[PDB]
Design a protein around this ligand. Structure first.
Ligand SMILES: Nc1ncnc2c1ncn2[C@@H]1O[C@H](COP(=O)(O)OP(=O)(O)OP(=O)(O)O)[C@@H](O)[C@H]1O
Ligand SMILES: [Mn+2]
Ligand SMILES: [Mn+2]
Ligand SMILES: [Mn+2]
Length: 336
């Protein structure tokens, strides 16, 4: 959760037809600023897309016209937009308009002090219910940093090679085993086994619980549940199915390498435990810019006639991973 952070203004270029504004690079993000607002190297607060920013006309008067209603409280939800022909993602405001935060500097997460929350679409009914407890603390949650935020890491990972997978749009799902206990979790909570719960019901049609206890290992099968009712069903599936993308070694406190995972996925299907994996593409030796990685995000999804949300890259040592979301996808499904 780094929705509002203090960053450094990168390269600033003009925009033809209107010099009231200019285009300012913030790490891998691009963002339209008023002319005379930033100089290259200055510091400001960058608000990522999906930020929900409560209405304030001294601090956020440029969000005035897109103020909406969200959970009774009320402000502007930042999302991908084309302003005067220029693709613009996020918000970049200088430190002068935040007098209470001169004390901070680059890297500081100022989300909480600015009251920033995250907009989230209506999460469908069959994915939250009887909660047994918290997401196990001995299991890592399933978040992928955007490539736009890893500009130095991308260049220092030159030479490294990655497993490239399709980013399916559903919800994150974790089925795991610790000793005698097999469990089923959503994003932030372990759930109880009930009658129509999508996660638990998904985990039994593929018998992945009996596959985990068969492997006799403390592992965490983490994948994406997509299908009917879930996020518009972009792939046009029938029903709901689980598509694995990561396997967490509970005891070693690390993820399996993609080779370790691909060996475990086959071991499962060789023994009649039929699990699906997120679509696999050719592995990639990193050598590209952020903009050239993002240029690979668009393309066919699981349904090869629909355009995918993006891609996710996992270093073949299982230690470093990131996402790359199609910007065409974000413009098309503006409810995301
Ligand atoms: N092949 C894949 N590899 C890794 N993660 C994937 C894959 N396909 C889908 N995902 C999902 O993408 C999520 C990480 O991407 P992202 O940072 O966009 O998550 P988020 O913004 O927290 O939630 P959401 O993706 O629902 O908006 C994971 O929680 C995972 O469930
Ligand atoms: Mn995320
Ligand atoms: Mn998603
Ligand atoms: Mn998201």
């Amino acid at each position: 959760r780094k929705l509002a952070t203090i960053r450094t203004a990168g390269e600033i270029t003009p925009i033809a037809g209107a010099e009231a504004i200019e285009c300012c690079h913030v790490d891998g993000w691009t963002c339209v600023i008023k002319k005379g607002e930033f100089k290259q190297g200055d510091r400001g607060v960058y608000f990522e897309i999906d930020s929900f920013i409560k209405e304030d006309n001294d601090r956020y008067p440029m969000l005035s016209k897109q103020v909406i209603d969200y959970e009774g409280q009320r402000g502007t939800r930042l999302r991908t937009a084309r302003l005067r022909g220029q693709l613009s993602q996020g918000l970049f405001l200088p430190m002068d308009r935040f007098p209470e935060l001169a004390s901070n500097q680059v890297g500081d997460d100022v989300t909480e002090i600015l009251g920033i929350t995250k907009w989230e679409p209506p999460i469908s009914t069959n994915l939250s219910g009887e909660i047994l407890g918290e997401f196990p603390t001995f299991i890592s949650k399933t978040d992928q940093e955007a490539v736009q935020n890893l500009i130095p890491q991308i260049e220092e990972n030159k030479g490294q090679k990655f497993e490239v997978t399709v980013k399916l749009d559903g919800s994150s799902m974790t089925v795991y085993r610790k000793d005698d206990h097999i469990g089923v979790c959503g994003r932030n909570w372990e759930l109880r086994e009930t009658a129509t719960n999508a996660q638990w019901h998904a985990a039994r049609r593929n018998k992945m619980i009996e596959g985990l206890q068969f492997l006799n290992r403390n592992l965490a099968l983490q994948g994406e549940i997509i299908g009917e009712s879930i996020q518009g069903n972009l792939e046009k599936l029938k029903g709901q199915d689980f598509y694995l993308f990561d396997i967490y070694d509970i005891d070693k406190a690390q993820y399996l390498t993609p080779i370790e995972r691909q060996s475990l996925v086959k071991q499962l299907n060789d023994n009649g435990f039929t699990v699906k994996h997120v679509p696999i593409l050719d592995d990639l030796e990193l050598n590209h810019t952020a903009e050239q990685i993002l240029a690979m995000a668009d393309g066919p999804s699981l349904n090869k006639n629909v355009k995918r949300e993006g891609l996710v890259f996992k270093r073949l040592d299982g230690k470093f991973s990131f996402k790359a979301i199609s910007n065409a996808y974000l413009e098309k499904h503006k409810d995301r």
